[PDB]
């Protein structure tokens, strides 16, 4: 399922044309912004390198 908006046509066309300039674009970043790693611990270990 998808939803749209009842935008007036020519207004939308102007917006789209203004949205295709190479100076315009799209930026996005993940809110976590980190890299994951994990390492093992044998039972009854107490020191980790």
């Amino acid at each position: 399922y998808a939803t749209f908006f009842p935008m007036a046509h020519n207004t939308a066309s102007t917006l789209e044309a203004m949205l295709r300039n190479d100076t315009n674009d799209q930026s996005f970043n993940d809110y976590l912004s980190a890299a994951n790693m994990l390492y093992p611990i044998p039972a009854n270990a107490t020191n980790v390198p």
């Binding site: 908006f5 917006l15 203004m18 949205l19 300039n21 100076t23 315009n24 799209q26 930026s27 970043n29």
Partner: protein, 45 residues
């Protein structure tokens, strides 16, 4: 060093408002109440 990659990916330098074309800024200001756009760009710090 002034590594431009951060500017390119909008990591540093200008906020979203400046580098965008003026017409886009005007349009975004116009209809912010019922169609939001102000969070589709980085504008870092």
């Amino acid at each position: 060093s002034m590594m431009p990659q951060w500017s390119y990916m909008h990591i540093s330098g200008q906020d979203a408002s400046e580098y965008l074309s003026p017409g886009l800024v005007q349009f975004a200001r116009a209809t912010e109440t019922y169609f939001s756009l102000n969070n589709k760009f980085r504008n870092p710090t």
